[PDB]
Amino acid sequence: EDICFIAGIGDTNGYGWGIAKELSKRNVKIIFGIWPPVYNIFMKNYKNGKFDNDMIIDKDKKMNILDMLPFDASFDTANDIDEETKNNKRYNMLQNYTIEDVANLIHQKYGKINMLVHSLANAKEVQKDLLNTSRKGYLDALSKSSYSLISLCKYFVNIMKPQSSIISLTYHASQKVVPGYGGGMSSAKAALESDTRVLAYHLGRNYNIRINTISAGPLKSRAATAINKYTFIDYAIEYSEKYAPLRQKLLSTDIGSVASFLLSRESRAITGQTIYVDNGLNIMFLPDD
Amino acid sequence: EDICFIAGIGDTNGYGWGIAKELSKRNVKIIFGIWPPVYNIFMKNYKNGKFDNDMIIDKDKKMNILDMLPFDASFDTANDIDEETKNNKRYNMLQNYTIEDVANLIHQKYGKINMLVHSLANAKEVQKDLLNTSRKGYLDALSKSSYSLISLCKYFVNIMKPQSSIISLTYHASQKVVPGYGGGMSSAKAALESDTRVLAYHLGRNYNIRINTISAGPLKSRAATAINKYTFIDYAIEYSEKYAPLRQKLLSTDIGSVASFLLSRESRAITGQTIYVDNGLNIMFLPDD
Numbered sequence A, B: 001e002d003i004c005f006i007a008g009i010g011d012t013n014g015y016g017w018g019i020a021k022e023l024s025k026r027n028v029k030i031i032f033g034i035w036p037p038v039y040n041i042f043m044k045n046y047k048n049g050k051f052d053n054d055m056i057i058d059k060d061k062k063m064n065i066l067d068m069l070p071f072d073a074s075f076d077t078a079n080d081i082d083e084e085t086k087n088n089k090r091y092n093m094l095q096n097y098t099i100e101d102v103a104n105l106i107h108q109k110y111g112k113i114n115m116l117v118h119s120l121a122n123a124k125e126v127q128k129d130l131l132n133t134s135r136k137g138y139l140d141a142l143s144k145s146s147y148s149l150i151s152l153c154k155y156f157v158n159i160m161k162p163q164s165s166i167i168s169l170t171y172h173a174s175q176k177v178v179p180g181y182g183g184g185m186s187s188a189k190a191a192l193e194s195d196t197r198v199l200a201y202h203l204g205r206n207y208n209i210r211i212n213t214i215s216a217g218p219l220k221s222r223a224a225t226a227i228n229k230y231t232f233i234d235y236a237i238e239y240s241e242k243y244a245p246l247r248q249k250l251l252s253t254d255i256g257s258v259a260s261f262l263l264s265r266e267s268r269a270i271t272g273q274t275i276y277v278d279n280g281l282n283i284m285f286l287p288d289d
């Protein structure tokens, strides 16, 4: 029985969904971690069957979601919750949404898991360029998009089985400059990739757990659409579809099937790596046009 | 009907064999390309059942070998083979072993294939360090170990279906220095890796075909043993098992399962990449003890 917790899903148009979809093809139980502010709305859409078609698997089956829990990557433990949030309308009717709390919650209800997916990003000033990003906004991007991975590993390793696997999503902006990806997001991804290597060492040596990161190509999702700089995401997609070695549309399931492989034992020898799933765009220097 | 041609197998102790074994789990037909000098010995052992145990695939499956053909990567076409090798004791009783001839041969007997594996390397002066390698020895290593890939692509591309996949094997000595990996082999691996990217562009744009390379960890194979440096290989294996993030023996089938994934459609969005399957050793800078 393989159980996978996916941190970072707010709809069916992101990478988290493509990953859950592909893992279902392999019969793995899925648990969603939903950011509190969109939890109730997500449950409403779910309950009203708005995701039904999106849950049908190729092999003529239904995606099996074990559970859906409110989850906020910016809070490590219960005593980290501040006043302003502890009174927020969207957080009031919710409890146990901190990293340690969800880990205890999952362990208590379903036992130990063996697959972990970090699929979340957030930066307050993603619209501003690096030079004009404030210290507060910069640290916010790193806390939510980078440190969250470290904390997830620290708390979930206690409820994971040996030889389990972890993955996260990153973007090439960390290695090469892409104008438009601001707010410290490029910085956060750079830390994520570096941290993945160091975590691979500690997790590998002490628990025999693997951890890799997938560098994906452009995907018109909510997080992306909110980067605007006809917006940043529309440009990257068009560019990728014109100049990438492989001229085909990049689907969330393309990252999903690769994630599925990295999360399985088929890849027991791969760890601390940044795997590119972008139709090869990253190998290009000079375009044809 | 998936058909894969594996170029570079002289026994069951190499990566070519582990790859063949893993591909058989997915029921893909295997065609072996055997270097002429060792063709007779290999057929002899196979015939006398000296590989029957190695052909056992976990699930009691029996490795499915479609065909076994003599093959020499140093010759592009029939009129490339010199008089000497032509009348050589080991080549006399054989024919159609050049790159162009095996392609036409496979096509004529089985039609188009969709999987190509370049699993060979060779260097006359591997025992010498770069500084002391002659021009002749250097060009020989590149000719046999690097150009062979480009040539294989040129002739096999015509007998491959769209969306097919190609992989080769490389070693980290191309990116970082490992004393002992001489004769221009480090050079050859560097070329192969760069060529993999360039070919991904061409193969991808014109044939919608993918090509990637696997950077494997140390394996005590025949080619590896030739690198007399208690030999280079024993050191590398011992060093990998004591310092890699994942302390475990690296099996040929570990590279095999990754090869299998890259050759299947599950990796449609990956191309031109160098994927490390080395228990994570490449991410380390300073060893522990």
Ligand SMILES: NC(=O)C1=CN([C@@H]2O[C@H](COP(=O)(O)OP(=O)(O)OC[C@H]3O[C@@H](n4cnc5c(N)ncnc54)[C@H](O)[C@@H]3O)[C@@H](O)[C@H]2O)C=CC1
Pocket: A007, A008, A009, A010, A011, A013, A014, A015, A016, A034, A035, A038, A071, A072, A073, A074, A118, A119, A120, A121, A122, A144, A169, A170, A171, A215, A216, A217, A218, A219, A220, A221, A222, A223, A224, A233
């Ligand atoms: N869309 C793209 O073009 C690319 C995306 N990526 C990465 O893929 C990952 C997922 O992003 P997408 O599928 O693009 O977008 P997405 O918008 O579907 O997913 C991001 C999720 O993070 C959640 N989030 C924000 N702050 C949170 C917090 N404090 N706690 C928990 N959840 C929180 C949101 O609810 C959202 O569902 C991100 O890490 C992103 O950087 C990597 C390459 C490209």
Ligand SMILES: NC(=O)C1=CN([C@@H]2O[C@H](COP(=O)(O)OP(=O)(O)OC[C@H]3O[C@@H](n4cnc5c(N)ncnc54)[C@H](O)[C@@H]3O)[C@@H](O)[C@H]2O)C=CC1
Pocket: B007, B008, B009, B010, B011, B013, B014, B015, B016, B034, B035, B038, B071, B072, B073, B074, B118, B119, B120, B121, B122, B144, B169, B170, B171, B215, B216, B217, B218, B219, B220, B221, B222, B223, B224
């Ligand atoms: N063993 C190791 O530690 C590592 C090996 N590699 C690569 O893996 C690939 C396969 O090597 P191994 O499994 O190590 O050794 P192997 O010695 O079993 O296989 C190489 C094969 O190439 C064939 N060969 C040599 N010249 C040829 C020619 N002109 N035409 C056709 N075949 C020819 C040999 O018969 C041999 O079977 C090589 O490209 C090697 O560089 C990459 C990382 C590590």
